[PDB]
Each structure stands twice: as structure tokens, then as C-alpha cells.
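Hey Z.,

So I finally got round to the T27 thing we talked about over coffee. Here's the setup:
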Amino acid sequence: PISPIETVPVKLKPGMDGPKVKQWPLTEEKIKALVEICTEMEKEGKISKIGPENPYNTPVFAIKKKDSTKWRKLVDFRELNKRTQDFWEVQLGIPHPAGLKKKKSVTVLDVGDAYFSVPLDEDFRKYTAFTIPSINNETPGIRYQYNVLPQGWKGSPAIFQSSMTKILEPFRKQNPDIVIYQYMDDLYVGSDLEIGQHRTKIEELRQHLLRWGLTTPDKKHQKEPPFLWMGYELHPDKWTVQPIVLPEKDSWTVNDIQKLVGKLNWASQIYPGIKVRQLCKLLRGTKALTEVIPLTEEAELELAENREILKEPVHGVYYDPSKDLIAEIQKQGQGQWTYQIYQEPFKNLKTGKYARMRGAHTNDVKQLTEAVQKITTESIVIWGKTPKFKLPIQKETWETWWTEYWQATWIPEWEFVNTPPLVKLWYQLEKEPIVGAETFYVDGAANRETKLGKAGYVTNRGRQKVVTLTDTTNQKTELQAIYLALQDSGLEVNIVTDSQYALGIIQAQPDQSESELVNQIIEQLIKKEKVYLAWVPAHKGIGGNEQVDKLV
Amino acid sequence: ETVPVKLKPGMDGPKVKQWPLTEEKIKALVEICTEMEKEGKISKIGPENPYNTPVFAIKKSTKWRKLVDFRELNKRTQDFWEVQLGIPHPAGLKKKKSVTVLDVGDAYFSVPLDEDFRKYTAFTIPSINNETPGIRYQYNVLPQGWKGSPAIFQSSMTKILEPFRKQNPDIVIYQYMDDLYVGSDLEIGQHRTKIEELRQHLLRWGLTYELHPDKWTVQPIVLPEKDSWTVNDIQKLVGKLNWASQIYPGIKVRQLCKLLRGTKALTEVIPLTEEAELELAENREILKEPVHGVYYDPSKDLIAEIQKQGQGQWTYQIYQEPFKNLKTGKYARTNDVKQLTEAVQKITTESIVIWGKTPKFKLPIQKETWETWWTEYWQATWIPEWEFVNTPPLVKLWYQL
Ligand SMILES: Cc1cc(/C=C/C#N)cc(C)c1Nc1ccnc(Nc2ccc(C#N)cc2)n1
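And the result:
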């Protein structure tokens, strides 16, 4: 059928005219296929023969359908598409299973010839004109235009979905207890009715759909739960990811590893603790895709843990709108966070992992706070609600960091949970200069054209020193100079620098870094008992700055 | 009768995607919108409108209000609401002892919007978990939050205010977006009486806080007045002055630096010399006054930077070129993001009153954190533009109090 629903008005982009593309010659047998097919379609109303006036045209062709002996009709809508207006994005956003509510019974209905069942804006049909070529392209071809949504035209996905949504609205309005999801040409329908009345509601809906031009599978042809959908296995009362088989191989290609990382990342939505750090380091660099990468020790072991976590089926539950959500986060290892979200411990609605560096230097308290933020946004999308958090950090630790850190922050209601490793601050810089502690005036420098650097210090106790560095930068020498003061100093030390760069880094209390220097400087700060760090304007001629500026 | 509106030449409507909203806002947004729909202010739209702007709900009291983020539309119509017909900013407003701010946005709902412009005001009400299609709408009338609405209604507004302006020649009334600003030097009781008199005129046309800009003074860079001075203290001092040296003509440091002689212990106490105690004072008096040589340039964007000072204090500067401060200030007294959200609104309010313009904000926060939370605390009808920055640690203390 062709739905009786009203059409969506459409037009070409503002300056443009419709397509005028020449139909190329086709082989005789493709010409025969097209004639039979367009004859079928024409008798269904799908297309109409058009007069000589219509100046627009769009090429067409025919292909032998799969491994069968029927043909398909393909239209090339490139030109028309480039000239057609933009539409509302079909709809961007897929429901996550963990957001779905438990259902007693669920059914899938398959919409027949979806696109060809919806009418095309009458004013627009003329621009869909196409021509079936005569043999050897000797005589004028048979010309047609579409009356329905062509397959392949820019606007069909969006006008179809809108048409369905509009058709469904009465049904939804008279059936609020019932749940329906539109994806492409599929409808899924959930109820908390028993098999009997549910089957009855499905028929009223089919009748309603057929009243509107849309044919569906009979009570016999509707697929059974559990369904595969978007990589998921849905059951009425639980959900999981669809089967994931990790291959047994002696040799892993770059392509094998990427795909393995992909499946593992996918499974981590519901399999707790999946890790891919070690496998991911392998992907590092830049081989060819067919290149073999021997697994490291810590990668072959990582595969081991994962293969274990997966050996047994795991499902997530569905969302109860009446209850709070609880999110728990653990530090796995090196910048790797994992988390679980549940309403009844420990039946997870879903799990996940967070592993991102924001900047070259951070600390566990920053990273934890970022995972919290990532999880909060995710909860808003999936449930429209923020979770209550349980975090491996003491309220005192987090309150110490937040207050004295210069960036603003905030995380929703949370409370301490003792799941080691606990996140902590590994050292605190002093807030006032230290008495009885040597003052190191440090300074580092680099000649831009040489890549040569000197780094050094003078102290109030008269200690002095300079070390030469090669291929270094200004930024590096300033960090080396502070590193030097740290190595040569006692457990308490004041350090005066003119590098805002160095001060920024260290004052942020990093506990890990991409820089070897900074990692050492950090290792050094853990050892100290008290470090006070001070900044001074360079070259302003300051008592101690001037001194070690003359040496380096 | 509608006024023809068009975008800036070449460019296309906004296609800004809707943010995730909580269950509650979505609920409130549906209620509100079905009501606006049967009053004809908005109409449902089809997929042939590809445009979008974000929407959300605020409670300013407990009453949900709809707020549409027209920053992109506004940017994309900007020639229209500024340089065709536009609203003049009176310089006397910032001088008044009392300015009252009144919401008159509800007046726009009585004016038809140019039919061919309507499609650009498209917005979407999302569903949770994307389980059903968003509810899409267009405006039929002048929308709140769009900078075109007061431009178009301006003609009706002066007519409405004409009697009251005639009867009170010394009161300044300024419109910006959905608000009226009303200033006088009347004693506060009589100022209020006049605000009420004003509301009564407004009420005959379909419209139902107090600032004291006069009492705004800059927050100088503060120079400590130490009982006793250490090397550490004197080095801080020099840095602060060093930095001020690039804003304020005449700042001097050379005497003080002389006190930093050789390589001393940070904690060593040092006597302040005759010439040093003199700079100190000279620089304070300079720091007390406005920056000589800095001026507001009408063609340039205003920028506003905010630093977290801890303990609930926040410092800020307004400038067009870095370090050329038009205005500095602080704002005081829980939740970091709540305080920041409040400080932004306050600063935007002063900025509108002073220049008739909102600043582009540099916010000391993580994009993600701000975006999750700010709508929880927003109480204003506009939204300024903003970006996110890591405060250079020094800048923070140089502005500390
Ligand atoms: C988004 C969605 C995807 C599918 C996708 C179907 C497929 N394939 C099926 C339905 C019915 C829905 N819509 C909603 C809305 C609210 N709760 C639920 N719960 C729910 C849905 C399916 C199963 C099952 N089995 C269990 C509970 N579904």
C-alpha cells in the first residue's frame, strides 16, 4: 500500500535546480529486468509514467540480486541528493539496554516495503524522474517519476521515521501502558501484559498500522525473544552483550588485535574489570595491518585475565524508576578506572571503564574526579538521573585537594568505600618558606639555535653547581634545575625559580606524567619531608635570581 | 503585522544539538510546551526543518521556566539586532544610585514572528535514553532570549514607556534582551514607588532585583603592609609589582629589588629602606586609581576572567586586550560551580549595565564539569558565551586580596 498520511513538503537547496543527468546505455538483459520491475511498481502506484515535458532525469541501473536469479532496481541519487535540502537528523542516540524497564512480553514487528509505503511530496516528485533506456539507446526511453520515498534518496530515512511517529501517536495516546520503539523499518513492542492480551494488543496495533498503509508480519511470523539488537542480546528481564568469541591464535596481526580490543571494549559494558591497556600498547606505533605483533608478557597475561572474565555468561538487569542508582569506581591500575552501576547490590544495570589522560600531568584525584564526571553525564543520558557514588577516596583527602586547587569542581553525593588501591595525595608542597632549610636558587636555560642547555643552582649556604645538557629546551632546563636542587638538598628545602612553567606543573601536585623528568622530580618529592617552591620574575635582577643566572 | 527578518548574508540557521536533560526538566518542558502550543506560540514541526537550538528548564522560587539557548541564532542574526535598528546604551545608567531589573520578556509573546524566519527557531524536547523521538517545535511569536525580539518590539516599547518617561525626565530606562533596567537617584523608598508606578503602565500592555551601580568600586591589586618583611615576602612583592608594571604606567620596583641582594635565606627578615618604603606608597596610590590609557572600544568583544581564590572568594577582570583592565572586582560567599555560576551572572549584569554588552567568559573549570552542572543554578534569561581555561597560578595571587 501507500500510506494515506500527508506528505512532508520538500524543496531543493535554495539556489539549485533539479538534476538533469543523462541516462547511459544498459545491456539488454538489464533493460529487461528494469522494465518488468517498473511495470510491477507502476501498478502499485509506486511510480508513474511521465510526459516529455519533465526536463529532469536521474540515472538508473539494475543488479543481479545476491546469489539469486532475480534483479534489483538501483537508482543513482547523487545529483538529486546534493541538490536536496538538509533534514532533521533521522534520530541520533540509541537507547542503552540498561535504561530499559523490565517487560513481561516483547514482540518485533517488521514493516513491509517501508519506504515505498510512504508518499512523496507531490511538488517534488518531478525531480525523481528517471529513464529506462531503449536497446542500444536507439529510441526514446520509458520515463517515470516516484510517488513514494525512493530508496537511496537523501530524505527518505527522515520522512519515513516522522511518518511512522505520526501514525503511531494515536495508538500511543490510547495505550500509554504499552511501549514501542522505532528503529529503521522495525517496531518493537513491550508490555507488562500476559501472553494472551499482549497478542491481542499486537493485533489492534497491526490493524491500526494497516489502516495507515503499513503491512506487518502475521501472528505467526513475529520473531521470538531473545532478540539480537545493536550488538546486544535482549531478554524480557535481562540483557547482555551478544556472544563474544576471542580467537585462539599463535600469531596476532595488527588487524586481529584491533578487533580484539574492540570486542573487549564492547564487552566491558557488562563484564566487570575487562582491561585492554597491555593489548593497546601493542597497537602503538604504526605497522601495516597485516603485520604480526608478538604479544608482550604483560599483554599475554592481560589477554589471560580477560579470557577468564569472559569464560562465563554475565547479564545486566533493567532499570527500576522507583530506586536510586549507585555507582562504584575502582582504580584498576595505571590510569585505568572501572565502575559498576546498580540499584540492588550487586546486580549491575551496567559496567564500564574510564582511561583518559587530560594533560601530560595529573594525579589520581583529578582522574577519579573525571571518571565521576564521565559517569554522571552517562547517567543523565541513560536514566535522566545522577547516581549516588561510592569512591575509593577519603572525604578528608578530596576536601584537602579541592579547596587548595585553583580549578573549580563538584561531584554529586558520594561516600567513602574501602576498595584498594585508595586514591591519595602522595606529597603536599609547603605553604610557607621553611626555616633552617637551605634555599636553592635554581635556574635553567637553553640556546634556541644550539639545543644546548645549562642547569644549576646557588644556595644561601654557598653551595653551587651547573650541569650541561644537550638537545634540550628552555622548558626542560628549568625542570632539570629544580630536579638538581632536589637531589642535592636535604629532607627540607626551599626552591626559588623564575619558571612559571615549572611552577604550574609541580604546584598541581602531579603523581604521574608522560615526562621522565617530571616522574623523577615526583619520585624526589615523595622522598622529601618539606619542599617550599617559590617563583620570581626572571631578569628583573633579583638578588638570588641574578646570581645563578650569571652561572648558567 | 510582522517585521521581515533575515540571517546574515550567506550563513545558515543554527543546528545545535540538544543536551541531555534530567527526567524533571523534560517533564516540566512538556507541560510548558503543550500549553504554549495551544496558545499558538509554538507549533510542532516536521523533518524538513533541519535546524535546532538547545532548550532547558530553570526554577529561576518554585515555578519551572523554559529557557532557550539562542547564542548561535543570535550570533547568526547579529547584524540585524545591532546595526540595522538597534537599542542605544545610555551612559547615565551606571551612574544611578538605584537600578531595578524587570523581566518584560512575556511581552514578546504577543507579537507575530516573520513566517519565513520561524524555522530557524526550531528546538527539540528530548526523551530519556532516546527511547522515543524528540518533540520538535517552532515559534510563531517573538521568542524570549532571541536578540531580534527586543529589536523588533522596540517600536512598541518606546510607545509604552513614553508617558512614564515624559512624566519622569530623570529616570533612565534601558532594555537588553528580555529585561528592562530602570535607574534613578531617588531615595530607595521613592525609587520603589516609581518602579511600581512603572509596572502599572506595563500591566496595561501585558507585562506583570535592585542594583546600586553608583556604589561599585574597583578591587585594587592589594599590596601587603607587613609589620616585618622577609626575603620571601619581598620577592612576592616584586612579582606583584612587576606584573602590575604592565598595566599601570609609573609602577617602580628598582629600590625594592635592591633589597634582594645576593642569595639570602627565604625566611631572613630584612629592614625596609628609606627609598623602598617610598615606592611602596607611590605604587599603592597608583594601584588605587583606574588604569591610565585603557578605554572601552565599542567594536571589540568584552572578555571576563575569573580566578578561584578559595574560601568562597572569586576575583575577576573585564578587558578587551589582556592586562588592559576596564574593570576588576570580587564576589564572595559550599558548591564551587554554584558560586561560579552566580559570579558569572553578577559580572554579566554589571557588564550589561556599564557597556550594554555581555562578556566572553574564561572559566577556571573543566568543560565537562561546567556543562553538567551550570543549568542547576542558572537564574538568568540570557546566557553569555564562555570558554574554559587553566588559570596560570601566578595571575591568581597577583589578584588575591
Ligand atoms: C528501546 C527499545 C528497544 C527494543 C529492542 C528490541 C530488540 N531486538 C525493544 C523495546 C520494546 C524498546 N523500548 C522500550 C522502552 C522501555 N522499556 C523497554 N524494555 C525492554 C525491551 C525489550 C526487552 C527484551 N527482550 C526487555 C525489556 N523497552
